[PDB]
Design a binder for this molecule. Structure first.
Ligand SMILES: CNCCC(=O)N(C)[C@@H](C)C(=O)O[C@H]1CC(=O)N(C)c2cc(cc(OC)c2Cl)C/C(C)=C/C=C/[C@@H](OC)[C@@]2(O)C[C@H](OC(=O)N2)[C@@H](C)[C@@H]2O[C@@]12C
Ligand SMILES: Nc1nc2c(ncn2[C@@H]2O[C@H](COP(=O)(O)OP(=O)(O)OP(=O)(O)O)[C@@H](O)[C@H]2O)c(=O)[nH]1
Ligand SMILES: Nc1nc2c(ncn2[C@@H]2O[C@H](COP(=O)(O)OP(=O)(O)O)[C@@H](O)[C@H]2O)c(=O)[nH]1
Ligand SMILES: [Ca+2]
Ligand SMILES: [Mg+2]
Ligand SMILES: [Mg+2]
Lengths: 39, 420, 440
């Protein structure tokens, strides 16, 4: 039970870190697109 | 084991090159990468920073990055310039013109993929990568904007590794480029979320040390970087030489970072160019800090002290206990035993030296000073069109300011906190 | 028959194991190559030293020992050092990345990757035993591997060996030689998870050993080498009853019957004498009465606490060298009339005595004088709970602000494990108060 609970929790900590980093790459696409449609 | 070093932009590459010159001399590595030293202690942990090549050559695990070729041509011509791996030079032609948005979103995004190709090549041949250290300034466009983009991309591919920065904070006393506070605030917003440990190297403090203490009427970048290279040698001693304490990046982070966002360290050095009592008093003196913060204006969460040279370990222990006992008000009572001491036998042209790493709530003085200069410009939207021109919205400046003001509040919260 | 397997975990466990095995080789006349000329039975036997040493057909005496660390640099010094030929390579187990002073990394993230291999190597030692008695586990409380990997291993050994005895030698943290701010977290987490899996634990306070080295051996600034030589003498006194024969010799298991009144109350206080420099020992012979008297001086204890302010539940004296029962009994009678020795009302007051005739040995280049007689006192005193109270207080200061807790949560741990571990320590502190109250 402890090693399963631990594996789950660690994987959820990392998945959320990657979700935050993927939203930055999403926001960066939006900024480079905003520059294009300004010109 | 292995650390991968990245140096980004003009400042990053200038302080980066001095770092490699200084630690190559300490490890007995010459400019052709040959070992000509006199001690086994020099080679025991050489693999932390150097790769071994054909013919017992040592090659820095170093990647050199800029959007402008000029500074990297001068590195290649610098004394240790031939020691770097030629394929580890990654440069564009455009430049960033001190514009964070060009470094982070437009010019830098074009170059970042070829930097990651080199990072991946260095990372893949590591027995067991500890993580990364980046040297950069926060006041320009490449080191600031592209530096923080690289951190975000490296973290996406190596999320379980430690990310460490040597981050040079801007001052009106050294550059008269007026958008530096914008670039520094936008950079701090990235560093708060995406680094584990940041050494705050304040150009304000380096200028004041060169002027007031070392009596240099007209400090150059050369004079500033002499202080930076001595500090950087000091704070990496425990990573590079056999030893007990903070001997790898994760162990340092676990000793120094009680809350994930409060990872901005005030480095110190003594003597500024000596008995153990004098080293100890000087390394804790406001005048010896590489961040323009008075430690008596806050409290220490955590401290690492590193003594270098042949000296009495008994005298070092007694003096380190003396400073804590006599200054007990400036160490939070709810982190017991929060000051750790290392002694390394190899000194840096000195018989003895002390390097100080502090996680002090007084670091809020550095962020408040940047925040004041940011607001003075941002309230009149001065020069914003250079940033909106690259696709950024005003709201991203508002968010960066709020997050840096939140960081200040958080240092203040732990400063006021009490055990009872 | 009656084999004991030693398991040395992490830097402290490994460096203390190096000092213990060096000393056992010198005590039994075993050379660094494993040869023992005095042993006439080649390739096996059931002599008392065979509890700790197996024998190859080539006459090599091999420690019944596994060394485990999650990084290689400490065990690499055993692999290339003076005693490199003593150990088969498969007894020396290393990973690539350590637990970074984090219990959660030692128990879960890094530890899970090597635990099946370690149990494999331990099984290989167990399979060569005709009557395995149990395990001796050496570790720090403070390190990530010493704390978290040891907890994992002790849990897995309870599963694979059921109720086989597990004894610990546990290094309790001191600020003079500590390497991590989070040692109190690691200490409480491992004490909580290990407590149901351990039969008997000897705590060694680095601060008590540090002070004994400074005060009694005149070492200005003790190193691990200084501390470990002294610790090895105390460990050797405790295991001497398993490794030597003699008429007056009393097996450690028989002392354990007296030392553990309730399963949780299993932390004996060790006190060792004499600890004396060669310069002070010269023409000063310490008698049975002097070394016995020195066992009731708090300054000679392995854990800092004051037994004069608690109650005894047991007192055992393990003598080695030139000691006869007459001199012991006169020493004890004198001490009873003079010292603050108060037993709980439910325990008999008799001191239990063992004598092993083989005198103490010292390691060349050591700080300790070679003496004709020595003693280790093992007492079960309520005063040992002071050591828990000190660690619990440091835990509470940091945990009230959740200082450093994100390093544990990042590795998959929950806050609930912290509060559960701390509650178990509160209940332990309370158990030590209760056993000291008089019967109604
Ligand atoms: C007037 N001695 C020249 C000063 C100089 O060369 N500097 C410091 C330049 C490079 C500079 O950074 O100008 C900044 C402003 C500044 O610090 N000062 C001293 C300045 C500089 C100028 C006029 C000024 O008004 C009197 C002032 Cl106050 C002169 C101007 C507009 C230079 C613009 C250069 C752009 O390159 C094509 C830039 O580098 C600017 C860049 O965007 C970019 O993408 N690239 C944006 C973000 C920079 O915000 C700015 C504007
Ligand atoms: N007596 C003694 N204490 C030691 C020794 N080595 C380390 N310690 C203590 O043990 C604690 C640190 O744990 P270590 O054993 O170094 O750590 P580890 O088990 O290797 O764990 P990680 O390095 O975090 O993977 C501190 O309290 C140290 O003072 C040693 O040789 N002797
Ligand atoms: N201490 C120090 N600061 C520098 C150096 N070079 C540039 N800076 C500072 O860096 C900031 C500008 O960033 P720079 O590295 O020049 O821009 P980039 O090349 O776009 O990253 C300013 O605050 C400068 O004062 C240097 O060699 N040493
Ligand atoms: Ca035999
Ligand atoms: Mg520049
Ligand atoms: Mg270790």
């Amino acid at each position: 039970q402890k090693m399963e609970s631990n594996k789950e929790n660690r994987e959820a900590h990392l998945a959320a870190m990657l979700e935050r980093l993927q939203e930055k790459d999403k926001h960066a696409e939006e900024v480079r697109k905003n520059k294009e449609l300004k010109e | 084991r292995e650390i991968v070093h990245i140096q980004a932009g003009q400042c990053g590459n200038q302080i980066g090159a001095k770092f490699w010159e200084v630690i190559s001399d300490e490890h007995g590595i010459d400019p052709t990468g040959s070992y000509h030293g006199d001690s086994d202690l020099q080679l025991e942990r050489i693999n932390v920073y150097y790769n071994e090549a054909a013919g017992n050559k040592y090659v820095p695990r170093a990647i050199l990055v800029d959007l402008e070729p000029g500074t990297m041509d001068s590195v290649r011509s610098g004394p240790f310039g031939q020691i770097f791996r030629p394929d580890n030079f990654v440069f564009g032609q455009s430049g960033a013109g001190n514009n964070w948005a060009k470094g982070h979103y437009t010019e830098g995004a074009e170059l970042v993929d070829s930097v990651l190709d080199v990072v991946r090549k260095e990372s893949e041949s590591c027995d067991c990568l500890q993580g990364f250290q980046l040297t950069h300034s926060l006041g320009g466009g490449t080191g600031s904007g592209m530096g923080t983009l690289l951190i975000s991309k490296i973290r996406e591919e190596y999320p379980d590794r430690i990310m460490n920065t040597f981050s040079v904070v801007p001052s009106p006393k050294v550059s008269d480029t007026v958008v530096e506070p914008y670039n520094a605030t936008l950079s701090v917003h990235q560093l708060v979320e995406n680094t584990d440990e940041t050494y705050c190297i304040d150009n304000e403090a380096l200028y004041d040390i060169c002027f007031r203490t070392l009596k240099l009427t007209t400090p150059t970048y050369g004079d500033l970087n002499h202080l930076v290279s001595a500090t950087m040698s000091g704070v990496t001693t425990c990573l590079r030489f056999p030893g007990q304490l903070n001997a790898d990046l994760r162990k340092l982070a676990v000793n120094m970072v009680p809350f994930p966002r409060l990872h901005f360290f005030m480095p110190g050095f003594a003597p500024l160019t000596l008995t153990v009592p004098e080293l100890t008093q000087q390394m804790f003196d406001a005048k010896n800090m590489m961040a323009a913060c008075d430690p008596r204006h806050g409290r220490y969460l955590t401290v690492a002290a590193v003594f270098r040279g042949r000296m009495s370990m008994k005298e070092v222990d007694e003096q380190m206990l003396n400073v804590q006992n006599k200054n007990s008000s400036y160490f939070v009572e709810w982190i017991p035993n929060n000051v750790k001491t290392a002694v390394c036998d190899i000194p840096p042209g000195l018989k003895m030296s002390a390097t100080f790493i502090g996680n002090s709530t007084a670091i809020q003085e550095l962020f408040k000073r940047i925040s004041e200069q940011f607001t003075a410009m941002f309230r009149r939207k001065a020069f914003l069109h250079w940033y909106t021109g690259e696709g950024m919205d005003e709201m991203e400046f508002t968010e960066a300011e709020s997050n840096m003001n939140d960081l200040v509040s958080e240092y203040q919260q732990y400063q006021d906190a009490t055990a009872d | 028959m009656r084999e004991c397997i030693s398991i040395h975990v992490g830097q402290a466990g490994v460096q203390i194991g190096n000092a213990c095995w060096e000393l056992y080789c010198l005590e039994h006349g075993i050379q660094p190559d494993g040869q023992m000329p005095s042993d006439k039975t080649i390739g096996g036997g059931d002599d008392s030293f065979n509890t700790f040493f197996s024998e190859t057909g080539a006459g090599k005496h091999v420690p019944r020992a596994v060394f485990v660390d999650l990084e290689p640099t400490v065990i690499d010094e055993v692999r290339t050092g003076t005693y490199r030929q003593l150990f088969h390579p498969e007894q020396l187990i290393t990973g690539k990345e350590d637990a970074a002073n984090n219990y959660a990394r030692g128990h879960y993230t890094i530890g899970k990757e090597i635990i099946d291999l370690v149990l494999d190597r331990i099984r290989k030692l167990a399979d060569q035993c005709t009557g395995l008695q149990g395990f001796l586990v050496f570790h720090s409380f403070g390190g990530g591997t010493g704390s978290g990997f040891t907890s994992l291993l002790m849990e897995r050994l309870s599963v694979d060996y059921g109720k086989k005895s597990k004894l610990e030698f546990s290094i309790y943290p001191a600020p003079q030689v500590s390497t991590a701010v989070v040692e109190p977290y690691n200490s409480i987490l491992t004490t909580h998870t290990t407590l149901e899996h351990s039969d008997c634990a000897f705590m060694v306070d680095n601060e008590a050993i540090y002070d004994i080295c400074r005060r009694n051996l005149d070492i200005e600034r003790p190193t691990y080498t200084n501390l470990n030589r002294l610790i090895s003498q105390i460990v050797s006194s405790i295991t001497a009853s398993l490794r030597f024969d003699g008429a007056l010799n009393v097996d450690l298991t028989e002392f354990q019957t007296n030392l553990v009144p309730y399963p949780r109350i299993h932390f004996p206080l060790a006190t060792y004498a004499p600890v004396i420099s060669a310069e002070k020992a010269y023409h000063e012979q310490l008698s049975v009465a002097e070394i016995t008297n020195a066992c009731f001086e708090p300054a000679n204890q392995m854990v800092k606490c004051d037994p004069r302010h608690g109650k005894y539940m047991a007192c055992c004296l393990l003598y080695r060298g030139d000691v006869v029962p007459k001199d012991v009994n006169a020493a004890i009678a004198t001490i009873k009339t003079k010292r603050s020795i108060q037993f709980v009302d439910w325990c008999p007051t008799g001191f239990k005595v063992g004598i092993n005739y083989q005198p103490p040995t010292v390691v060349p280049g050591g700080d300790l004088a070679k003496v004709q007689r020595a003693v280790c006192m093992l007492s079960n005193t309520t005063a040992i709970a002071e050591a828990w109270a000190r660690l619990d207080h440091k835990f509470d200061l940091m945990y009230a602000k959740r200082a450093f807790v994100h390093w544990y949560v990042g590795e998959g741990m929950e806050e609930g494990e912290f509060s559960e571990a701390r509650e178990d320590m509160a209940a332990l502190e309370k158990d030590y108060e209760e056993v000291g109250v008089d019967s109604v």
